[PDB]
Design a binder for this molecule. Structure first.
Ligand SMILES: Nc1ncnc2c1ncn2[C@@H]1O[C@H](COP(=O)(O)OP(=O)(O)O)[C@@H](O)[C@H]1O
Ligand SMILES: Nc1ncnc2c1ncn2[C@@H]1O[C@H](COP(=O)(O)OP(=O)(O)O)[C@@H](O)[C@H]1O
Ligand SMILES: Nc1ncnc2c1ncn2[C@@H]1O[C@H](COP(=O)(O)OP(=O)(O)O)[C@@H](O)[C@H]1O
Ligand SMILES: [Mg+2]
Ligand SMILES: [Mg+2]
Lengths: 456, 86, 57, 86, 456, 86, 456
């Protein structure tokens, strides 16, 4: 049947239904004669349900008719979502017409069971040397991305979007949780110009939308990724900012009147994070790997939001303003960036020793640079001077030309395998390329390309 | 915190700089414009790059101002350009 | 002997001021952890008083 | 032998239920009976006497002591042991 | 018609009237038999009004009849109020009999319109070195003396009354809000013994009085000042503590059924302050020059009450507990204090350069104070050692013995002029007194006496 | 002369009664009128004029002033004066 | 007559009785089908009373019949309690059969009157150096041991139980309020094997127990101590942790309908503490010497429970985690610990000046900690260097191996007389030991053993 609005207080709307037709928790409701969708949050009793509006409540009044849809917010899924921009409800926000959908899925579901987990800790080959060496990503894993603006965050996301589709037959989904409308338009044109737009589905929840939209956009993008995973694919789920997902939950919890927890967060903080993060896993059919940008409140890593998020992350990629100033791109910090997969029981002793060898040389070089800047280069030993020469070659060999960066680098893009990455750094650590100049390793790809560049 | 996260950039004014005679108290070290040179005329964009380097250098060499006698000519040089640009 | 001792003195002073700079960094790091604890506790206590006062009114 | 993988995650789950039931919070927003949540659980790990086992089994098991050993796990933030749950 | 007391809780009283006869917001009510007045704060509905008692509630009982007066609290205004001491309801609290009133005005009023605002910048000399240098006042403007407990707010207000009120040829109003009854007695005998009392209207509401009195005494004193302003006169308005008006609202807010805001203050903190502060102004008709003392809870200038007060004032004088803890008086902070009149286009470049010069020297010394305490004075540069000595001398030359402080200091009081103040500080900045000892500038009026103290 | 050995304990007793009467709490669960609790007490300690004493005693005592001096005591926690009662 | 359960919420139960048969405050009630005991806390009106269960509430339901006993919880008292273990309700829990009681006393009583108080100052030697020096105890007085988790409260109490029983010939009463059940078993068998058990009464309500038991066990043990005091005896009353009595009160406070106070504590915190603490006193009839361990929540001595306890004690011993971390046991803090007996008229000038001398040296060493941490000891004056060397020796000489701590390390325990304690610290203050190495003072009992340890 149909219900009536009984109370309106900001974004919170109470609707009364007949006793035999009360809608379920999380069900999507439609206001008659107005394009307003309501999600049911609680059943108050007496046939009354409390709901949150998925848009502006201006112009609504008590007594308007409301219709139940019979299911949760159901969004379009599959191939038709690629190269399109959509809102939280799955509507096409771009002026490109209706989505050619064949199926629709509800945004709320249980995480895959204990018996559905895939097996061993298989790696995801990104084709990027510094990441595949120092920050190995596992299939079905969660990666935290740290750093400021203007350090290559967008270019790094576009390179990952191109490589998963062309080298692994996968797809990508981008969830703009609290997206800035200016940056959302700029990113859409940058992906069209870089020819990666047809390999990704765009879901945006803009900052000016009510708290309920910003909280559910992550589940809409995740529902599209779950359809691609079920086709037997390996998928990339990009979350614009995981801190804004936490804040949207705090805002909704305060609107519903719940008693606040430590530091003012919602009492459901760990459960809301677990419901989202537990769906991102590797299963018997396929996998969803996620790259999530992380914001740290007041620079305090012990704050409930960062602390609750770090329990789900498998790797940490840190972008450095200092590395970008030297002309190296990507600006990953090989010393601050880390991975739970960087273990000899997971990646094997050869990859582990090569990566730890590179970190040892770069760490000691950072210490030698401070001595050179105070006492002078003449105070270092002959062995230290040789280490400085190897460290500079390793440091430049971490650089790589990207297919989406050809406009900036003026060089053709490169994809480097894990085998080629380990072999190249192992050779420089052992001294097999000590006779080559430091400029031969900069922006070349595999180790054979450095050997050929040195002859020009 | 809310408004810093909504805006495209921030101009931070500081009480310590304002009391030290630096009247338009803009802290260039933390202030940012995510649009950047796209919002600048050709002449200003060209001359602005050198100005930023000087102000950064002076920030990394301010303490050595009360002991300039014992500095390399080149470090002494960077400092004097920083003090004038500021 | 006097001039070489003065060269040794400036070299000893370099190490002492390097150590003082490093020792001050450890004290700053410990105080920052104590500060973050006080920052989180103040927000939790203010919220507890506001929820407690609004439950009574 | 019993292992509790995260006794600090049990305290976070019990805090959520208590706040949703509107019980007034205390230190670090935890409920007033958070000590009793862990103390009533860990008091069960113990060694019992031959007389306890003989009484419990109605005479079937004679001459043996029984035991339950526990290895609870607690996660700390920035190595701070002085926090309320630890 | 008449109503009946239905409930009493502390200072708040509920009264019930016929539904056809509910009294208006802010309307005054009188209890039958007992000598008490009530002010309607709210109309609760069903003929009940919520009110704050303007006297103690110990004698009150439920069921006492109450008479509606048909208007707000109305106080005597004009020439008859000069040389008299009065309470919140305008009753005489001196043994001099009834007031020779000819007109009464209600204490609740709208602020002057945007078109009625004045624009004068006429500089006012105070005779106090620090104030005349960094905080120049102007006729018809608003001044605030910010400070914690025991730093000099009353003493500086008494010196300002002596150097302005006595010499002035207009009318004055002195309002003691939440003041110590001993200070009110000392000031009354002081105005009476000085023959100044015939020019001043005195309104007193001390700390021993009920919350309703302390919540309205500021409106009574301001209503008397507004009558004089609207007659075309130039008036002086003194308020010993405006923080006590805010506090009386916090004490009663929760009993009025209002949910608390940050730091436990009433939700109406900024509006209750704006409704009062916007009436304290100079208009096209006449002028009000006002000096208010502002208490700072726990010496924290970021507390919501002090923080909301700065925007309402033209001159902000800040008193520091750290300066008072060093025996230096007046304990004014030259770096935190400021005035709208400190502009070369309003005063002159010579004054402005001297003020900014003093501030520059003291600001640089604030970072060196912590250096000297760990590594010693000898490690500073030749320019830093000299600057530190001048800063410590400037810090002492800010001190001056006041005539109202002879009972605390033992030495006699000094009045210093604007030109004398400028010349003294320029001399220390240019190095004309580098040879004098640091102790010679402590408590000595003008620059000449410092040269003489060095010889003793 | 009067000594109040602990006004901070009087404030804790007043806070208990007020919370049990269900009056809404303030800055540290203390009643809204905790300032008026102490100001109403301490303003009685004063010196009264000869005219006040002559009027109070109906002329039995003349040419003499009367007084009550107070020495209230307050306890702080680790030197913290920012607490509401102190 | 009898009533009926109307509501159950955790440990709190509401029971309705006929209007002419409503039970009194603190009256004991029994549930008919399970024999569970309930204690009445308040009368709600309409014949309804609110009570706390003295056992588990699992399996109870609404509508069960409840019997009023006409009196409060009554426990056995006198000689029959010696060498026996009892629960909160006075039942035997040692499997040794029924208690041969001559009479029973109700657990609720008023404190002895102001005219019944005793003025005792007779010094009690503990044999522990730091306690006998800066915290001298007195016969018939109260002692409190303050400390965070795992710092020494139980070990330092077990060592005091061992040393005071050397000179004391009377009876002892031990109340276990909310602590480990294993520690109660260890203490019972230790005394049984040592033949000390026939002079000690044991009461337990450990951590495994429901809130009602933990809340009333303190009263049960104190009721047995008051019987022996009132018989004209000198008895010892030991409490495993007095904080648990207050905490059990916090768990139940919100269920009793009370508004919370600061940091979630019950509004009755200081009254609940005073009602128990005032009964634990010596009178003109007999004496009670009492020792109590006080848990300090999260190491915060400013927390409302510890802060409210200091005023109820004659001697305060404050334990520190910073001191325990250096290796020093007992981990007592001389600068925070104090006693009413530390007076020249009680202990004599020689002891008083030695204790004051030790505190002056330790205070001055604490002021230099930050300077020593940044610049090291070599920058200090010739006077400060000598004082720091003596402070380090004093700090180590305060340590002492205990006869109950032998299991932890292997070292034999030491008992040091007051004469030997004063002589050692006086010599270190005078400089008689400036030549011996700093490690010779660590863990050595008397001062002569430091001279023998220095030979190695
Ligand atoms: N791989 C790269 N190769 C060359 N230049 C790069 C590369 N990555 C980033 N840059 C430079 O850095 C600029 C900013 O990078 P971008 O991804 O847009 O960072 P952000 O999104 O935070 O603004 C680019 O426009 C380009 O000039
Ligand atoms: N200018 C001054 N000279 C000497 N002593 C002063 C001066 N100003 C304040 N004091 C001292 O400080 C005390 C507090 O000043 P007061 O004006 O009463 O403080 P406030 O009103 O800010 O609480 C005075 O009673 C006096 O002892
Ligand atoms: N005097 C001591 N000597 C050596 N170790 C000690 C001593 N006192 C305490 N400790 C150490 O600290 C631990 C905790 O002591 P305990 O008295 O149980 O602490 P608390 O009762 O304060 O929680 C002991 O098991 C032991 O390892
Ligand atoms: Mg004052
Ligand atoms: Mg223990």
């Amino acid at each position: 049947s149909s219900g009536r609005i009984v109370q309106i207080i900001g974004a919170v709307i109470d609707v009364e239904f007949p006793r035999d037709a009360v809608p379920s928790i999380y069900e999507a409701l439609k206001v008659q004669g107005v394009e307003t969708t309501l999600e049911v949050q609680q059943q108050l009793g007496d046939g009354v349900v409390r709901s949150i509006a998925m848009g502006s409540t201006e112009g609504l009044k008590r007594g308007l008719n409301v219709d139940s849809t019979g299911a949760a917010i159901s969004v379009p899924v599959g191939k038709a979502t690629l190269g399109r921009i959509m809102d939280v409800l799955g509507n096409p926000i771009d002026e490109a017409g209706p989505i050619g959908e064949e199926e629709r899925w509800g945004i709320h579901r249980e995480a895959p069971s204990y018996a559905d987990q895939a097996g061993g800790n298989e790696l995801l080959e990104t084709g990027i040397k510094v990441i595949d060496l120092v920050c190995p990503f596992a299939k079905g894993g969660k990666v935290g991305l740290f750093g400021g603006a203007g350090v290559g965050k967008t270019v790094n996301m576009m390179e990952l979007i191109r490589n998963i589709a062309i080298e692994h037959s996968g797809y990508s989904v981008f969830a703009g949780v609290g997206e800035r409308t200016r940056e959302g338009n700029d990113f859409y044109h940058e992906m069209k110009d870089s020819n990666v737009l047809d390999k990704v589905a765009l879901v945006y929840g803009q900052m000016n939308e009510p708290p309920g939209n910003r909280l559910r956009v992550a589940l809409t993008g995740l529902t599209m990724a779950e359809k691609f995973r079920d086709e037997g694919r390996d998928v990339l789920l990009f979350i614009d900012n995981i801190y804004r997902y936490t804040l949207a939950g705090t805002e909704v919890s305060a609107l519903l009147g719940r008693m606040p927890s430590a530091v003012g967060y919602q009492p459901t903080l760990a459960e809301e994070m677990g419901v989202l993060q537990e769906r991102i896993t590797s299963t018997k059919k396929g996998s969803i790997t996620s790259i999530q940008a992380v914001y740290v409140p007041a620079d305090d890593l012990t704050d409930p939001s960062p602390a609750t998020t770090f329990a789900h992350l498998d790797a940490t990629v840190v972008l450095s303003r200092d590395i970008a100033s030297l002309g190296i791109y990507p600006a990953v910090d090989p010393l601050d960036s880390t991975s739970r997969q960087l273990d000899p029981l997971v990646i094997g002793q050869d990859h582990y020793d090569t990566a730890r060898g590179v970190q040892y040389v770069l760490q000691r070089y950072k210490e030698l640079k401070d001595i050179i800047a105070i006492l002078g280069m003449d105070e270092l030993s002959e062995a230290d001077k040789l280490l400085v020469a190897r460290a500079r070659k390793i440091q430049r060999f971490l650089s790589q030309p990207f297919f989406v960066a050809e406009v900036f680098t003026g060089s053709p893009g490169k994809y480097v395998s894990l085998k080629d990455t380990i072999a190249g750094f192992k050779g420089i650590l052992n001294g097999d390329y000590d006779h080559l100049p430091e400029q031969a390793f900069y922006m070349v790809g595999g180790i054979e390309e450095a050997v050929e560049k040195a002859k020009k | 915190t809310n408004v810093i996260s909504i805006t495209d950039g921030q101009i931070f004014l500081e009480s310590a700089m304002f009391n030290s005679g630096i009247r338009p108290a803009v802290n260039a070290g933390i202030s940012v414009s995510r649009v950047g040179g796209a919002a600048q005329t050709k002449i200003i964009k060209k001359l602005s790059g050198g100005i930023r380097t000087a102000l950064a250098q002076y920030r990394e060499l301010a303490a050595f101002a009360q002991f300039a006698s014992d500095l390399d000519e080149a470090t002494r040089k960077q400092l004097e350009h920083g003090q004038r640009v500021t | 002997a006097v001039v070489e001792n003065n060269a040794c003195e400036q070299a000893a002073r370099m190490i002492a001021m390097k150590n003082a700079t490093d020792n001050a960094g450890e004290l700053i790091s410990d105080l920052q952890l104590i500060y973050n604890k006080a920052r989180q506790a103040a927000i939790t206590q203010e919220i507890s008083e506001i929820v407690g006062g609004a439950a009574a009114v | 032998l019993i292992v509790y993988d995260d006794l600090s995650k049990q305290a976070v789950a019990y805090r959520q239920i208590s706040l949703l039931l509107r019980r007034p919070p205390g230190r670090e927003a935890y409920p007033g009976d958070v000590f009793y949540l862990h103390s009533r659980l860990l008091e069960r790990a113990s060694r019992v006497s031959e007389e306890y086992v003989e009484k419990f089994t109605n005479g079937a098991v004679t001459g043996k002591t029984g035991s339950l050993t526990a290895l609870p796990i607690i996660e700390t933030q920035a190595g701070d042991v002085s926090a309320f749950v630890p």
